[PDB]
């Protein structure tokens, strides 16, 4: 768990060197993008349940997975699916605020593949659900904030696949 | 000479990071590591300077 600042400090410390001009430029880049990160995080905190339910309405609804036999069939499985998608959106917001995806592979992508493979959860359908969540939130917060959200959404989909 | 550098290094890291904890968790127990070594008020007026 480290943001862009802590990773820059960790690189300069593992070097043992002081903060040179490249580290200063990286921190200036983060300190310019931080206000946009803050406003996108507020806008995403506004519409958590709406983004999640629009992602299910785009991908998972009216398909086979909500029908009998699907892994999203029962009300318990539906509630756990909404819980999993809320987790993905919340941690993508955290990784957007930090500017570093270390929290994603520390706390989402750690044992997620083995959990989903033990439960029988389809990984492709949940990857499509995360992609639709990314599409909806990029329609919500704009072009560049949607892109800096979608880089961590693509990180979650890549670590899941 | 290395330590008079190093105090400034973690001062700079604390200034960028926004929390002085990086200074705190290092130079708290530092005193009895270097008390057999050297003069401690010399280090104090060094950091003040």
């Amino acid at each position: 768990m480290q943001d862009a600042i802590t990773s820059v400090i960790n690189s300069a410390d593992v070097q043992g060197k002081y903060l040179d001009g490249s580290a200063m430029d990286k921190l200036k880049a983060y300190f310019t993008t931080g206000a946009l990160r803050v406003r996108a995080a507020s806008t995403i905190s506004a519409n958590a349940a709406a983004i999640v339910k629009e992602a299910v309405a785009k991908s998972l609804l009216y398909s086979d997975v909500t029908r009998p036999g699907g892994n999203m069939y029962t009300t318990r499985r539906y509630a756990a699916c909404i819980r999993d998608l809320d987790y993905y959106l919340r941690y993508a917001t955290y990784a957007m605020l930090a500017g570093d995806p270390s929290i994603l592979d520390e706390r989402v992508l750690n044992g997620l593949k083995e959990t989903y493979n033990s439960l029988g959860v389809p990984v492709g359908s949940t990857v499509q659900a995360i992609q639709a969540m990314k599409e909806v939130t990029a329609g919500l917060v704009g072009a560049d904030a949607g892109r800096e959200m979608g880089v961590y959404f693509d990180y979650i989909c890549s670590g899941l696949s | 000479l290395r330590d008079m550098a190093w105090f400034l290094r973690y001062t700079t890291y604390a200034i960028v990071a926004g929390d002085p904890s990086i200074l705190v968790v290092n130079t708290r127990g530092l005193k009895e590591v270097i008390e057999n070594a050297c003069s401690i008020p010399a280090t104090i007026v060094a950091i003040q300077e």
Partner: peptide, 26 residues
Amino acid sequence: LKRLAIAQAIKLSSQLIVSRAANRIF
């Protein structure tokens, strides 16, 4: 950005700070 400005100022002139410390102490 102000914290970076003062950090870059401290880094760019750390040698003379350490040298001033050196003839303050020894």
